[PDB]
Amino acid sequence: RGSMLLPNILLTGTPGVGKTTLGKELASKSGLKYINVGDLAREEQLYDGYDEEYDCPILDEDRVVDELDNQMREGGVIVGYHGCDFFPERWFHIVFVLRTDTNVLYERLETRGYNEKKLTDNIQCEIFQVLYEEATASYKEEIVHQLPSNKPEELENNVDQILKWIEQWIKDHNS
Ligand SMILES: Nc1ncnc2c1ncn2[C@@H]1O[C@H](COP(=O)(O)OP(=O)(O)O)[C@@H](O)[C@H]1O
């Protein structure tokens, strides 16, 4: 019922940690909408510049924000991306940074067929905790949380914890 106020959630962390697997499952089991920012920019061609080095077009951050702004004002969206400093702070009610042990994350990305230089850049992003610090610099510390994401059983505990959070938030914000 388009009579209920619904929350917005950010899922962030290094490529490989489990963001899209977790977001699709939360969407199926809550009725909220999951948007993968990478897939959105491909579908709507939201790019400015090309990367010869990595062989890929470069994300246009301001056109991403314009494209999503009205949907975000209406509520009930889960957003997934490997960055977060350029999103409006007002968009999110809670932020989760997914974390994966370096040994486990290395094997996930190798099987996806990343080359040597791509492997190294992402493994260093995780061991230096880059996305965790970006989140704490951009949102209030009490709404930012780290989630372990190394095995099926952790995926299952994350789904259960976030589904319960969503049910309690809806009760508190529809008196
Ligand atoms: N908790 C988990 N346990 C084991 N494998 C996982 C877990 N979460 C995700 N994966 C797997 O890791 C790989 C990358 O997950 P994905 O959703 O594509 O990462 P991201 O969206 O952050 O780049 C996929 O093969 C997926 O099945």
Cα gap 56→64, rounded to integer Å: 17
Resolution value, angstrom units: 2.1
Q: What is the CATH number of the domain that holds 167?
A: 3.40.50.300
* Alpha-carbon torsion (70, 34, 118, 54), positive or negative: negative
Question: Measured from the CA of 151, which atom of ligand 1 is nearest?
Answer: 3
Domain that holds residue 168: 1-175
Task: Tell me if 21 is assigned to a ligand binding site.
Answer: yes
What is the spatial distance between Cα 67 and Cα 152, in angstroms, rounded to a whole number?
Answer: 34
∠ CA 6-8-14, rounded to 5°: 155
Residue 98 contacts residue 22 (beta carbons within 8 Å) = yes
Please give the number of the atom of ligand 1 that sits closest to the Cα of 11: 22
The answer to whether 14 is a known ligand-binding residue is no
Closest ligand 1 atom number to CA of residue 154: 1
Q: Where on the phi/psi map is residue 45: left (φ > 0), alpha (ψ -120 to 50), or beta?
A: left
Name the experimental technique: X-ray
Residue 16 labelled as part of a binding site: yes
**How far apart are alpha carbons 5 and 79 in whole angstroms?**
17
Residue nearest atom 25 in ligand 1 by C-alpha distance:
108
CB-ligand 1 contact for 23 (6 Å cutoff): no
CB burial of 129-167 (b: ≥16 within 10 Å; e: otherwise) equals: eebbebbeebbeeeebeebbbbeeebbeebbeebeebbe
Number of structural domains found in the chain: 1
CA-CA distance, 157 to 112, in Å (whole number)? 25
Separation of CA 175 and ligand 1 centre (Å): 37
CB 61 within 8 A of CB 86: yes
Is the beta carbon of 166 within 6 A of some atom in ligand 1?
Answer: no
Question: Is 157 close to ligand 1, i.e. is its CB under 6 Å away?
Answer: no
